[PDB]
Each structure stands twice: as structure tokens, then as C-alpha cells.
């Protein structure tokens, strides 16, 4: 990675491989020009310890470091634990077509719908709007449609009301504890910059309104819209899966 300062603060792996190749080339040269009897041994010890620093740093006695106290990262520190490929990149991923803001009340909602801003609904639902523009014939190519929805002209709000209409979104509170923590709503466009969320539903999220933040996701494909309508809609989950108590208790 460049740090935009004329220098490369390198990753730890290139440092480790560079140490192994330095030590290995010096050992090839020392086996070339003959080792002094009981001498071709210290260099092989150094090579073994450099490879043991590369494959799993810190498992052998005291680990190495580049700067300054922190031990640098080997391969087994990229597979294991947190900050590794199993728990940070493969089981939970960062996801396109998503957004997040601060929640609020708005009690004029039916319980299968939530308020969602015009700016968030315009930025989540961009390629739907592109498809409706070049399907109705208001832009020739994709670039004219992109510049139309960047300027936000007076026709794309009608396009946006024609793409929101029967299309669920997934609302998500950030510590998801049980399976009612992800639910699916049908959006209503709001002038403003917050997510208006039905009050009874906030019994299941364990969410007050003292600065809580919720994240919305969009189901792209068709089967995911049917799963966010038949399986995950806010009217269906009125009973908890822990017991038979209703979760729509008026608070």
C-alpha cells in the first residue's frame, strides 16, 4: 500500500518473505564457498527460525517485530482468530446496496411499512431507476440516465415512487441478538434524513430512540423479494420463537 508520502509502509508478509530469501541466499553462498567444518550450522538455525517466524510467528520463543513492540503478522495470524479470513471476510461480509441512519418514531405508519428518506431511497435504488429510464425512453444510454439522476430532475421522483411501491427492504439493528432483529418493511418516502420506524415494532429490536442507528439493505433478486415478503415481513413475526408470547405488546 502507498501512504501518499513517497514511501511504502509494507505489509508484514513481504518483510517475512524478504527475511527468508536474504537468509537463504546467504546460506547458498556459504554452502558454495565451503563451510568452516563445524560451522555450516548457525546459518541453518537462522533459516529454520526465519521460516518458523513466517509460518506461525510467536509460537516459537520470542516473536519478531518491525515497529516497535507489536509482533508482526505471519500466515497463521491471517487465518486464525478475529481479524482473519474466517470471521472477518468469509462469514460476515461488507455488502453493496445498503445504507444506515438514525431512527425516529412517526406513529402514522401501518406496521408493515417504515419511513425512509428520499436521498437514501434514491441512492440505494439507482440501477432500478436506470432500468426504468431506459425502459420508458427518457435517456438513450446509461450515461445520460446517470447524469439525470445526479441532477435529480423533476421526473425521477415519479420513477422512484414507481420502483418503491411493492418492494421490501430489510431493516437491521446493529446488535442483532435474536432472529426478530432483522425484519422487512415496505418503504414510504420521507422528506428528511431519518428512518421513521413503527413504535410497536421497537419492542422486538430492544430499540429506544436516544440515538439508535439502524441499517437498511435491499433485496435485489426476485426470490429475495418473495422471501422478504412471505418469511420476514413485520406482520408475520408477531410471536416470539422463545415461547408463545406476542412480541407486539404495546409499550
Amino acid at each position: 500500500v502507498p501512504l501518499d508520502g513517497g514511501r511504502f509502509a509494507t505489509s508484514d508478509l513481504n518483510d517475512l518473505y524478504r527475511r527468508v530469501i536474504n537468509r537463504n541466499n546467504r546460506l547458498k553462498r556459504l554452502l558454495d564457498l565451503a563451510a568452516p567444518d563445524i560451522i555450516v550450522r548457525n546459518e541453518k538455525r537462522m533459516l529454520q527460525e526465519a521460516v518458523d517466524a513466517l509460518l506461525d510467528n510467536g509460537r516459537r520463543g520470542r516473536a519478531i517485530t518491525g515497529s516497535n513492540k507489536r509482533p508482526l503478522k505471519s500466515l497463521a495470524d491471517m487465518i486464525k482468530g478475529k481479524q482473519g479470513r474466517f470471521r472477518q471476510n468469509l462469514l460476515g461480509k461488507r455488502v453493496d446496496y445498503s445504507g444506515r441512519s438514525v431512527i425516529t418514531v412517526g406513529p402514522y405508519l401501518r406496521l408493515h411499512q417504515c419511513g425512509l428518506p428520499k436521498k437514501m431511497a434514491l441512492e440505494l435504488f439507482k440501477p432500478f431507476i436506470y432500468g426504468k429510464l431506459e425502459l420508458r425512453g427518457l435517456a438513450t444510454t446509461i450515461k445520460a440516465a446517470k447524469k439525470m439522476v445526479e441532477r435529480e430532475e423533476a421526473v425521477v421522483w415519479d420513477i422512484l415512487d414507481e420502483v418503491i411501491r411493492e418492494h421490501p427492504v430489510l431493516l437491521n439493528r446493529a446488535p442483532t441478538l435474536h432472529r426478530l432483529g432483522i425484519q422487512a418493511f415496505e418503504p414510504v418516502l420521507i422528506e428528511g434524513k431519518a428512518i421513521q420506524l413503527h413504535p410497536l415494532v421497537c419492542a422486538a429490536y430492544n430499540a429506544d430512540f436516544d440515538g439508535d442507528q439502524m441499517a437498511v439493505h435491499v433485496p435485489l433478486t426476485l426470490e429475495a423479494q418473495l422471501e422478504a415478503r412471505a418469511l420476514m415481513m413485520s406482520t408475520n413475526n408477531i410471536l416470539s420463537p422463545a415461547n408463545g408470547e406476542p412480541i407486539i405488546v404495546p409499550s
Binding site: 474466517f86 461488507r94 441512519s101 412517526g106 436506470y130 436516544d210 439493505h217 426470490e223
Partner: protein, 1316 residues
């Protein structure tokens, strides 16, 4: 009497306890510690002189050369604070040191050096502290925070219960040096005694007692008493003192003097001990089985054979008695090894020892230190003398020697920094005494065992580490060169010293970035007692007890102001009156209650002196003399509260505000809030934001003026006098003559700090609050700062609140606000963003900043000038061009997508050599013109003050009333006047005037040099353009507002004016809260604050009514006097009969928007006083007005509570959190979207959300949620084509990060594949 800014708006003050010690200067920890650090300090310690006299003289490797120390000196900084923050340099001062080199001769190191050389040398740059208590490291104002750590000295801990799973407690005795090797004595379940050094391998403890050259006979002489057996004609008689027999069952019938004393099968009672010591029984008779297991003390040798009869510390058998009996020994010395009294811990320890003399012990210690190498007697002596017994590698401080003498019951608190033999032997004696059952262990969290480091001591330690590295270099270049030809600047180099101190002030765990968006946040971030950092504990490891308030935090560390979350109780905040002791502990004031009378002398107690005495509580009633009016008074004796008698008390608290900190003493009615809600209220009061026009608190605590003046945001007058010229830029004070120097004629100029960027992107402004011609006193505010008003502290604004449920829009914690609030522009905060653009140096050539730019037209370039940089004043949108930049390819700086603003300030810095373009020359001419005008006005204004002094002197003694203004004004000296003090004073003013002339010449030349020169910059950058956008963010549904008690809330709907519940007068309420947050979240103080705020506004409305009708000053005097008396025995006692009919009109001009009321923390306004003040206004007594509705126009039943609450806007806004992403950039190593908001990123669909979608039957939603939308690149381009063509369908593929998992597992020796 009152100061003149205290006759502007005198705050009404409830409160009953008459104060005796005012609030000290709140920034005394930082300033006093760093003043202790850097100052010319004789008699050795403390300061830099301690390091320079402990690491010097560097003497060489037997080359008879020596680099000794003389003195040091800091020159002036090249840059003052403002130029340093603008440009970006450290605010440092060069540390010149006078070092001396001496070089001894041959055969006489006690002989004469042939040559010396003493000279000045440059080393390091230590950063100075500004007057606010902060450092400027790289243009960013940073604070070093005090650390709370363990006090050096002995410490007798007890590893209770958990070890060995049998309840047998251990006891360890950690000696904690200030610098050097640790030392832990402990036990084991076999009751052996084990030493260890720096948590290494374990040895039996007496191996170090042989290492101090003790024979075993002397060791048993120290650690045990003696039992004497005399062989006198019958059964080997015994000397017996019966105190050892207290509860022991004898094995025979103890008789003496022909009298049976003790029977066999019974124990010796205490009265039998009294019988035996009253009859003075000395010699008793023992059987042959009594000395069957008695342990001998010293070695007995047979005189004939020359052999050893029995070794030392050995039990005696029949044959050993038979050997020593026939050798000629009549005295036998043994030891007393009881079950309860004295265990044989030393004896079992010596039986586990394999060693036998000093040499073997030193070999074993040298072998446990450095494993597996040949020891030598010289190497073992050198190591064991350099562990504990050398001035170099081991040093208790004075704090360490005090705790080490105090916890061993010594007398002298002075000693050497190194240990000795008596010290370790007293540690082992006290450990054996604690194991025996007498004496107590020491807890950890007790604040007599927690020292407070600060900026000075930590900077001294880092500077000392830099000096030991440089002595590791000088011991190099000193005995490996030719002498005499070198000077002591070729040897010592400034790289490790400056690297060490620059790394500490630059990036440490305690040198942290100052949370600066509020005067309160500054003055409570500088007063912080952090437990973390180097030498302390860590957050994710410890623990339970250290996150808990000990009984001795009372009046030292605040109990209620601490950050909730992962570190509660580790980021403690220091209290109000809490100083720091001479050694580093905490101390707090008290009042010496002599036998009857509370004497008004203050008297500082530490944390261990508080425990022995008995302290009366702060609010105890006393009748005008000090006599306690009750005969049972609530006190606390030894960490435990109780009820004591009237005149067994020894101290009383000073004031009732001293348990709390300055964060949580601005909360009115603190005693009514539950402690959780007071914690959340203090923390959110720290997190406020400055509004556009900050008002005042109607219900304060009187602590606002200490927090405002004792911080550094207001412009406090230095010398009092008369104002001469007020302006939005500057303020000129003419100094009064009874405060004024004879020379340096003197009228002061305060250059205020106008609109500039804070660290939290707020707008640190200063507004002048004085009129013209106005008197000001010494120690008084002239210019209000951010969130100040007339010298008070106004964080948020005070608004009309009602507690009622209103149609669901305030459901959980939400807040509902009228449009009358946003129309008045009263939360409209002003933010400033800094946007930088560098001109780097790459291949194909350098870059271009000029406006001849491809791919753009008129509509972009109309807002730029002819040289790329945007104008000053051009109001831009989100996504225009500010700086046009093209590389050998458009890379112009743009406003980031979303923010508006108005460009207020443009800086251009040029690396020297590069051609300045036309706008950089425009800024250079501009700043030349500004600095030229400013220094010329300095000369003109101070010359005007000097000529006014000449006119003031020439009033008498040869006065010329007409002849004075006929001649030009620069010659007012050669007029008719003899040799007096006046011609002497005119000569001194001529000296001052010619000094100002030549000083103005040289300073204007230096300022032209500073403007004209280039600046040292990054490697390979041409010029840096910085542009300051100034957004004005108003309020909207989604911001966070909160009061001062923990009542948070997202504002949920900004209603119109008409819908608000109004009352039967006509006025709409501004904010409708929710009542249901009160009985669960027990913050009942906000309702008393609401009622007292309504009382304050009732008095303000009556003043507005009595003044709008143009009434004469008599009725205003009547009503203001009635509103200022109104209470019990209070402290205020003002009278308006000494305000003289013009101040009363101006005081009523300041009271007409409400009357400010002080309510101190635990001595506040009771309920009956609020009722009597609500009766003075014509408001209802219960505080509740009946309110109509805005929609229906018909009355709400059961009348509701209205009043004024002082609510704060927090800077968790909603157009800083809101974010959305369709398709942006993707990361490089794993093809997933980036993280964050500045990087246009997507929200983490974490692991528990994957579990929650497995928990439904949603399968396609999860498949596209982790294959199509996230990772698979061909899958997502197929998806994007399919979405813009209307075909909702996914082609799945494989995550590319799983292929990264295959490459990382495959890059090992592991062969992972994919079958079939």
C-alpha cells in the same frame, strides 16, 4: 461590593453554608507539574536536573576521560503559538546544554587533567506548554493526561483462597522499585519461603540471605529466639519462660520448688504462667523425649576429633545428644517452633537449600538470571551488586523510600535510593509476622497506594531513557578516538533524545488528542486521572475491583463522572478541590475542628492521614460560632460512615461541592438525580456543541464563572483600567495609574481570535462584550468565548418545555420541537471543515495548479479565479471545484459529496525554490500589508500612550498650557523643566521611544523575512493549498438533544407553531417531552429544574412588564430588591441602595429575558423556596398551568407541567451518520466493498445477521447477501446488467475471498483442493 461585570447581571444565589475556601485554579495539575519539570532548579531534584545529574558524568572504559555536566538553558522558540498552529511545526524550544570534557593523565586518576573544554551543545527539542495547559505537536493541540499507578515501596498482598484449592491463603511481599528489578517474596502450600526476581524462576528465599554474606548461625540468630538447655546433674534441665507455653499441652508433670504446677494431659493456663513468673521459676526438668525434635541453632564441633557433632538447623536425636554430651558442652541452644506462634518457615527453607556459602548462592542467582553459561565469582559479584545495590540500575524515589519506611514502621522517611541488608530482612520479618497472624495485609485500590504521575515526571522519564541511550553512544566515542582534538558536540548527537521525547509527545497511550468543542470539555479533559497506559492495567484484561469506587475516593476522585462503556472507573476524573501532594498522592482540604470550635484554617490531608482521624460531614448545622447544634453528628472514622458525638470530631469538610468534579457540579439539583442519570448527564454535558448565540443557564450552580475564567477561551484582563477602543478584531485597555509601571508607558492590546477551526470542527469564536469608555478591574472578562456569555458558561439554550404525551411523536425518548425554535435561529451551529490539496512530485514531471484545465467548461471555472484556487467568499455546493489540479489527467480537489459551505480562508504554502503563482503573491502582499499595518498600529498606539504619559507628567512643574501644542509632538522633552524626577522620566521615555523605533525597524525586517520565506515540507511536494469551508448546520429531525440530567432524545418532528399546546395567556410551548421517562429513569431533578426555571422566567416577565411600561427606577428598585432577598439564611445579601439609579436600569436590561439563579450542588434550593419564588411571580403554586390544544382547540384535562429547561444540542447530528451505497469502490486484497463513510462504503452484514437469516428460511436472500452483492466480481457485473435490463436474476459463482482462503492455506504446506 461587586466587580463591574458583576453589576451587569448579578446571579441570584440560594445556598446556606457560608464558604471558606474558594475554588482553586482548575488547571493547576498540568501547569504546576510542567513548571516543576522545566525550571532552573538548584539542590538537585526535581526536574531536568535530576536526569542530568543522575546520568552524568559519563566516564569512559578506563581511558581516563570524563564528560561532566555544568548547566542547561532553553532559548526562545522560533515560532509563537499562532504561527505554529497555522504552519504545522512543533511548538518546541531548543535545549542548549553546557557540557565539559576532562582528560586525566597516566598513573594518577587522582591527578591533574592536562586540558579541559567547556562548551555549549545542542540536544533535542522539548515542546513547551501553552498557558492553557496544552501542547502543540504537529499543529494539533494535544493534552498529556495524568496516570494513576502503583506507589513504589513494599506491598504485602495476600493471594486469598484460590490457590491449591484447599483454602490455605498465600502471602506475597512485592517490593516495587521506581526503576529497576522487582522482587517478590512468597509462600507455597508446603509453607516454604520462595523469592523471585522479575517474575523469573523460583528459588528458596534464604539463598539471597547467604548472598548478603550471612552465615546460617546468624540467620537463625535473626529469625528465631533461643531456648537454653543446661546439663546440670539431672535430666538436662531447661530455662523456661512460660509465655511460650500459652496453650500448649505438656508431655509430663511440670513441677518446681517441690510443687506440682502443670499436670500431664493438660495445658498451661495463663494463671499458671502468672504462678511460674511470680515465683521466678528458671530451671525445669525435661524427659529424654522432649528434645527428640528440637532444632539446634548453631554448629557444635568436637574439640578432640575436630569434626562436626551436629550441623546447624538440625533436629536432635539420642545419639547426637550422646555425642555432644561427652564432648564438654553444657549449654544447648535450640529454637521455638510453635504451631500458632512461630512456624519454622526459615528452617524448612534452609532445609530445601542446597547452597552452603556466599559463592554458591551468587552462582545460583547468576544462573537463574542468565540461563546456561559459566559463572565466575567476579561476574556473580558484579551482577548481584548491580541488581539492587547500585545507584545506576536500581532507584527507589523519595516516594518509594517514604512508603518503604512507613509500611515497615520506621521513623526517618529519608534514606538512600538503593536497598540494603536491613531492608530485605525487614521485608521477610514483616512477611513472617503477617503469616503468624498479627498485622494486616494491604489492599490495592486504597488511594494511599495509588500515585499520580503527570506531564513533568513522564517527560523526565522519557528524557532519561533518551539519555541512557546517548550514554551508550558516548561511552563509545569517548575511549575510541584521538584526544585532545575533539569537542563535546562531535560526540553527543541529538537524534535519540529528540526521537525519545518526540515519540512520547507524538504517539503515546497518554498523549492524546484534545477533545475541544466546549470550554467544559477542555477543562475536564485536562483534569483526568487515567489508569491505563504504560505501567498500568489494560481494558480487555482487568478487571472487577479497579472498576469500583473505593471508600477513600471521597473528595479526591469524582465518583459520578466517568465514561460508561468498556472502561468505567479506569478513566476517573479528578475532583474540584483535590490538589496533588509533594510526593504524588492526592490530598484534599479540611477544616481543623478544635475541641469546640470549627476553626476557619484549611489543612490538607492525604489518603492515609484521613483514616486515622475522624471527619465531620460537609453539611452539618452549626450556630454562628462553630458549635455543632446537634449532639449526634454524622461522620466517618476509618473508611466507614457512622454517627459520632459532638466533640470527638477532628475535621470538617470545607464546602459541599468537593465530592464531585467540575463536569458534574454544573448540574443543578444533583442530589435529586439517581447516580446513573447523573453520570449520563455529566458525560453529555461534556459532549455539547456551541450554538450561534449562546444564552445563559437560568438554573446554574454558580460554578460557571470558575469554568469560564479558569479555562482559556475568554480574554481575561491583565491590568485593569479604562477601555479605549473596542472592535470585533481588537480591544484596547488603557491601564489605570495605580496599577502601572513607571517605564514602558503601556496600554494593552488584546487581539481576539476570530473564526477559526477547532479540533471537533466547531467554530471557536471570541466576541467583545465590553462597551467603550467602560471601567474594567483586574481579573475580569473582556471578550466572551465559545459558549460563554458575560463571563458565564452557556452551553445550550433554555427553552419552554412541557411534560405531556403528545400523539405518539415522543414515544421512547424522542423530543418534539416547535418551528418557533428553528425560526429564531437558536440552535443553528456553525461548523468549519478543512480541505487540503497537495501538489506532489511524480514522473513525467510535476503537477499543475493553474486553471487551464481539460474536460471542463465555463460552468465549473466561473467559481475559480485565473489561477485555480477558489475565491474567498464563493458559496459553493456539494461537488464543485475548489482547487483545480491536473497531473501529467484531472485530479482537481472537489467538495465532498453532500456538504455546502462558504469558503472563508485560503492558505497557500510553498516549498522554497518553486515559482510562486499570482495568487500566492496576492496572499504574500496581503499578509505583508496586514503585518505592516499591525506593527505600525502597535507603534502608533503605544506612542499615543507614551504621549499621554508625557501630558500627564507635565500637568505640574513648569506647565505650558498654550505652548504645549504649538511645536510638533515628538519634541516634548526640551521644555522648561529642571533636573527633577520629571526630566529623568522624560529621558526614560525617550529611551523607551528610541527602543520602540529601532525595535520596529528590526521586527518589521524579521516579519518580512517570515512572510517571504518558504517552509520545509513533505518529501516531494510543491505547494499545499488549504481551504476552509464554513457550513451552517441548523436543526432537523434526527439530531440529538439532551438536558443536563440524562434525558436524551432524537428530535422526531418539527411541528408548526399552531399545533403547540398553548395556555390561557396565548404563548405556545416550545418543546413537548415525554413524562414516562421520569419514574423508571429516576432523574427527578429535571422537574425541580423545570419549576425553578419557570419561577425565574416569572420574575423576568414581571421585570419586562415593569420596564415596558416606562416606569421610574423606584418601582424597579423595589421589585428587584424583593426578588433578591427571598429566602432563609443565605449567602447573597445584596442591596440595590449602592447602585445609583443607572446600574439598576442596566441590570434590569440584563434581567428582562429571565433572572439567573444559582443553585449549588448539595446545598441547593429546597421546595418551599421554589414555592415562595413562584408566589413572587403570579404563577400557580404547583407549577402546573392548564394547557389548551393546538389542533382541537379544547383543553387538556388534568393540568400539565410547563417551565423552562436548559437543553443542549449534542454533536451527534444526523447528516453526519446517514449514508447510502448502491455500487462504489471495492477493496483490493479481498474483493469486498470498503468500510466507512468518507470512503464510500457499505454496511457490514455481520456474523449475527447471517445467523438471523439462517434462523428464518431465507436462503436466496443470504446467497445474494454474501455472493452477488458483496464478493463475486463476475456475479455482480452480471447482476448490474440484469438489474438495468429488468431481469431480476443472479448467476451465483464463488466468493473471491474463499479463493483467498485457498491461497493462504495453500501457501503453507497444506494441500487444500476442490474435489469432483
Amino acid at each position: 461590593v461587586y466587580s463591574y461585570t458583576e453589576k451587569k447581571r448579578i446571579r441570584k444565589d440560594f445556598g446556606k453554608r457560608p464558604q471558606v475556601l474558594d475554588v482553586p485554579y482548575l488547571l493547576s495539575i498540568q501547569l504546576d507539574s510542567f513548571q516543576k519539570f522545566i525550571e532552573q532548579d538548584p539542590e538537585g531534584q526535581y526536574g531536568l536536573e535530576a536526569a542530568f545529574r543522575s546520568v552524568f558524568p559519563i566516564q569512559s572504559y578506563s581511558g581516563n576521560s570524563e564528560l561532566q555536566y555544568v548547566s542547561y538553558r532553553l532559548g526562545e522558540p522560533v515560532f509563537d503559538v499562532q504561527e505554529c498552529q497555522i504552519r504545522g511545526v512543533t511548538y518546541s524550544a531548543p535545549l542548549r546544554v553546557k557540557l565539559r570534557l576532562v582528560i586525566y593523565e597516566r598513573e594518577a586518576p587522582e591527578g591533574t587533567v592536562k586540558d579541559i573544554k567547556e562548551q555549549e551543545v545542542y540536544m533535542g527539542e522539548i515542546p513547551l506548554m501553552t498557558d492553557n495547559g496544552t501542547f502543540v505537536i504537529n499543529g494539533t493541540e494535544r493534552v498529556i493526561v495524568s496516570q494513576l499507578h502503583r506507589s513504589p515501596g513494599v506491598f504485602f498482598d495476600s493471594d486469598k483462597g484460590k490457590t491449591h484449592s484447599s483454602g490455605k491463603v498465600l502471602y506475597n511481599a512485592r517490593i516495587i522499585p521506581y526503576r529497576g528489578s522487582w522482587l517478590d517474596f512468597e509462600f507455597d502450600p508446603k509453607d516454604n519461603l520462595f523469592v523471585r526476581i522479575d517474575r523469573r524462576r523460583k528459588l528458596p528465599a534464604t539463598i539471597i540471605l547467604r548472598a548478603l554474606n550471612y552465615t546460617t548461625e546468624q540467620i537463625l540468630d535473626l529469625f528465631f529466639e533461643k531456648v537454653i538447655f543446661e546439663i546440670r546433674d539431672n535430666k538436662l534441665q531447661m530455662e523456661l519462660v512460660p509465655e511460650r507455653l500459652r496453650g500448649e499441652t505438656a508431655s509430663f508433670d511440670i513441677e518446681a520448688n517441690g510443687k506440682v504446677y502443670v499436670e500431664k494431659g493438660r495445658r498451661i493456663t495463663a494463671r499458671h504462667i502468672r504462678q511460674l513468673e511470680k515465683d521466678d521459676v528458671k530451671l525445669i526438668e525435661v524427659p529424654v523425649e522432649y528434645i527428640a525434635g528440637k532444632v539446634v541453632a548453631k554448629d557444635y564441633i568436637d574439640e578432640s576429633t575436630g569434626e562436626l557433632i551436629c550441623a546447624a538447623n538440625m533436629e536432635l536425636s539420642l545419639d547426637l545428644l550422646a555425642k555432644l554430651s561427652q564432648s564438654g558442652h553444657k549449654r544447648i541452644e535450640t529454637l521455638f517452633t510453635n504451631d500458632l506462634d512461630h512456624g519454622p518457615y526459615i528452617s524448612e527453607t534452609l532445609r530445601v537449600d542446597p547452597t552452603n556459602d556466599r559463592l554458591s548462592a551468587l552462582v545460583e542467582i547468576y544462573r537463574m538470571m542468565r540461563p546456561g553459561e559459566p559463572p565466575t565469582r567476579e561476574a556473580a559479584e558484579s551482577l548481584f551488586e548491580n541488581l539492587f545495590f547500585s545507584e545506576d540500575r536500581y532507584d527507589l524515589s523519595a516516594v518509594g523510600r517514604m512508603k518503604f519506611n512507613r509500611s515497615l514502621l520506621r521513623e526517618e522517611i529519608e534514606g538512600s535510593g538503593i536497598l540494603s541488608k536491613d531492608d530485605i530482612i525487614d521485608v521477610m520479618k514483616k512477611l513472617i509476622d503477617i503469616r503468624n497472624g498479627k498485622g494486616e495485609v494491604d489492599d490495592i485500590d486504597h488511594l494511599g497506594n495509588r500515585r499520580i504521575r503527570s506531564v513533568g515526571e513522564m517527560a523526565e522519564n522519557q528524557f532519561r531513557v533518551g539519555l541512557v541511550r546517548v550514554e551508550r553512544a558516548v561511552k563509545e566515542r569517548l575511549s575510541l578516538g584521538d584526544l585532545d582534538t575533539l569537542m563535546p558536540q562531535d560526540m553527543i548527537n541529538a537524534k535519540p533524545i529528540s526521537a525519545a521525547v518526540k515519540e512520547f509527545f507524538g504517539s503515546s497511550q497518554l498523549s492524546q488528542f484534545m477533545d475541544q468543542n466546549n470550554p467544559l470539555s477542555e477543562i475536564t479533559h485536562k483534569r483526568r486521572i487515567s489508569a491505563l497506559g504504560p505501567g498500568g492495567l489494560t481494558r480487555e484484561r482487568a478487571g472487577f475491583e479497579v472498576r469500583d469506587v473505593h471508600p477513600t475516593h471521597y473528595g479526591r476522585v469524582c465518583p459520578i463522572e466517568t465514561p460508561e462503556g468498556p472502561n468505567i472507573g479506569l478513566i476517573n476524573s479528578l475532583s474540584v478541590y483535590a490538589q496533588t501532594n509533594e510526593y504524588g498522592f492526592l490530598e484534599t482540604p479540611y477544616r481543623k475542628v478544635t475541641d469546640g470550635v470549627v476553626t476557619d484554617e484549611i489543612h490538607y490531608l492525604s489518603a492515609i492521614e484521613e483514616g486515622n482521624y475522624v471527619i465531620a460531614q460537609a453539611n452539618s448545622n452549626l450556630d454562628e460560632e462553630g458549635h455543632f447544634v446537634e449532639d449526634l453528628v454524622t461522620c466517618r472514622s476509618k473508611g466507614e460512615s457512622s454517627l459520632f458525638s459532638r466533640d470527638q470530631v477532628d475535621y470538617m469538610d470545607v464546602s459541599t461541592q468537593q465530592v464531585v468534579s467540575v463536569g458534574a457540579s454544573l448540574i443543578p439539583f444533583l442530589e435529586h438525580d439517581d447516580a446513573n442519570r447523573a453520570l449520563m448527564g455529566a458525560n453529555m454535558q461534556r459532549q455539547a456543541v456551541p450554538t450561534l448565540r449562546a444564552d445563559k443557564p437560568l438554573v446554574g450552580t454558580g460554578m460557571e464563572r470558575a469554568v469560564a475564567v479558569d479555562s482559556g477561551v475568554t480574554a481575561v484582563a491583565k491590568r485593569g483600567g479604562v477601555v479605549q477602543y473596542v472592535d470585533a478584531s481588537r480591544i484596547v485597555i488603557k491601564v489605570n495609574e495605580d496599577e502601572m509601571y513607571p517605564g514602558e508607558a503601556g496600554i494593552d492590546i488584546y487581539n481576539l481570535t476570530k473564526y477559526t477551526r477547532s479540533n471537533q470542527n466547531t467554530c471557536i469564536n471570541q466576541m467583545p462584550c465590553v462597551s467603550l469608555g467602560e471601567p474594567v478591574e483586574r481579573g475580569d472578562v473582556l471578550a466572551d468565548g465559545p459558549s460563554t456569555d458575560l463571563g458565564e458558561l452557556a452551553l445550550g439554550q433554555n427553552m419552554r418545555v412541557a411534560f405531556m404525551p403528545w400523539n405518539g411523536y415522543n414515544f421512547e425518548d424522542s423530543i418534539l420541537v416547535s418551528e418557533r425554535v428553528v425560526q429564531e435561529d437558536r440552535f443553528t451551529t456553525i461548523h468549519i471543515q478543512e480541505l487540503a490539496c497537495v501538489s506532489r512530485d511524480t514522473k513525467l514531471g510535476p503537477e499543475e495548479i493553474t486553471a487551464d484545465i481539460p474536460n471542463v467548461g465555463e460552468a465549473a471555472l466561473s467559481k475559480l479565479d485565473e489561477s485555480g484556487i477558489v475565491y474567498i467568499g464563493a458559496e459553493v455546493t456539494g461537488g464543485d471545484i475548489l482547487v483545480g489540479k491536473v497531473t501529467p489527467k484531472d485530479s482537481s480537489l472537489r467538495v465532498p459529496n453532500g456538504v455546502s459551505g462558504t469558503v472563508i480562508d485560503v492558505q497557500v504554502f510553498t516549498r522554497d525554490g518553486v515559482e510562486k503563482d499570482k495568487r500566492a503573491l496576492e496572499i504574500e502582499e496581503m499578509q505583508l500589508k496586514q503585518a505592516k499595518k499591525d506593527l505600525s498600529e502597535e507603534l502608533q498606539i503605544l506612542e499615543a500612550g507614551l504621549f499621554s504619559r508625557i501630558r500627564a507628567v507635565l500637568v505640574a512643574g513648569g506647565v505650558e498650557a498654550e505652548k504645549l501644542d504649538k511645536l510638533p509632538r515628538d519634541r516634548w522633552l526640551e521644555l522648561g523643566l529642571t533636573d527633577e524626577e520629571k526630566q529623568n522620566q522624560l529621558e526614560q521615555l525617550a529611551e523607551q521611544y528610541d527602543e520602540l523605533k529601532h525595535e520596529f525597524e528590526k521586527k518589521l525586517e524579521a516579519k518580512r523575512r517570515k512572510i517571504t520565506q518558504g517552509d520545509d515540507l513533505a518529501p516531494g511536494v510543491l505547494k499545499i493549498v488549504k481551504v476552509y469551508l464554513a457550513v451552517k448546520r441548523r436543526i432537523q429531525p434526527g439530531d440529538k438533544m439532551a438536558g443536563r440530567h440524562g434525558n436524551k432524545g432524537v428530535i422526531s418532528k418539527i411541528n408548526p407553531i399552531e399545533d403547540m399546546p398553548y395556555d390561557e395567556n396565548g404563548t405556545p410551548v416550545d418543546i413537548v417531552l415525554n413524562p414516562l421517562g421520569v419514574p423508571s429513569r429516576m432523574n427527578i431533578g429535571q422537574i425541580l429544574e423545570t419549576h425553578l426555571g419557570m419561577a425565574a422566567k416569572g420574575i423576568g416577565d414581571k421585570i419586562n412588564a415593569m420596564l415596558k411600561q416606562q416606569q421610574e427606577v423606584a418601582k424597579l428598585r423595589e421589585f428587584i430588591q424583593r426578588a433578591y432577598d427571598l429566602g432563609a439564611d443565605v449567602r447573597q445579601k445584596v442591596d440595590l441602595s449602592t447602585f445609583s439609579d443607572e446600574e439598576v436600569m442596566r441590570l434590569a436590561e440584563n434581567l428582562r429575558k429571565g433572572m439567573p439563579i444559582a443553585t449549588p450542588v448539595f446545598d441547593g434550593a429546597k421546595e418551599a423556596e421554589i414555592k415562595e419564588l413562584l408566589k413572587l411571580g403570579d404563577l400557580p403554586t404547583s407549577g402546573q398551568i392548564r394547557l389548551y390544544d393546538g389542533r382541537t382547540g379544547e383543553q387538556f384535562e388534568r393540568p400539565v407541567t410547563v417551565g423552562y429547561m436548559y437543553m443542549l444540542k449534542l454533536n451527534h447530528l444526523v447528516d453526519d451518520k446517514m449514508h447510502a451505497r448502491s455500487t462504489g469502490s471495492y477493496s483490493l486484497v479481498t474483493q469486498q466493498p470498503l468500510g466507512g463513510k468518507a470512503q464510500f462504503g457499505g454496511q457490514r452484514f455481520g456474523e449475527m445477521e447471517v445467523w438471523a437469516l439462517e434462523a428464518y428460511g431465507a436462503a436466496y436472500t443470504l446467497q445474494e447477501m454474501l455472493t452477488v452483492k458483496s464478493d463475486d466480481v463476475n456475479g455482480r457485473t452480471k447482476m448490474y446488467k440484469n438489474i438495468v435490463d429488468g431481469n431480476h436474476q443472479m448467476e451465483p459463482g464463488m466468493p473471491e475471498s474463499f479463493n483467498v482462503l485457498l491461497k493462504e492455506i495453500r501457501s503453507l504446506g497444506i494441500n487444500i483442493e476442490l474435489e469432483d
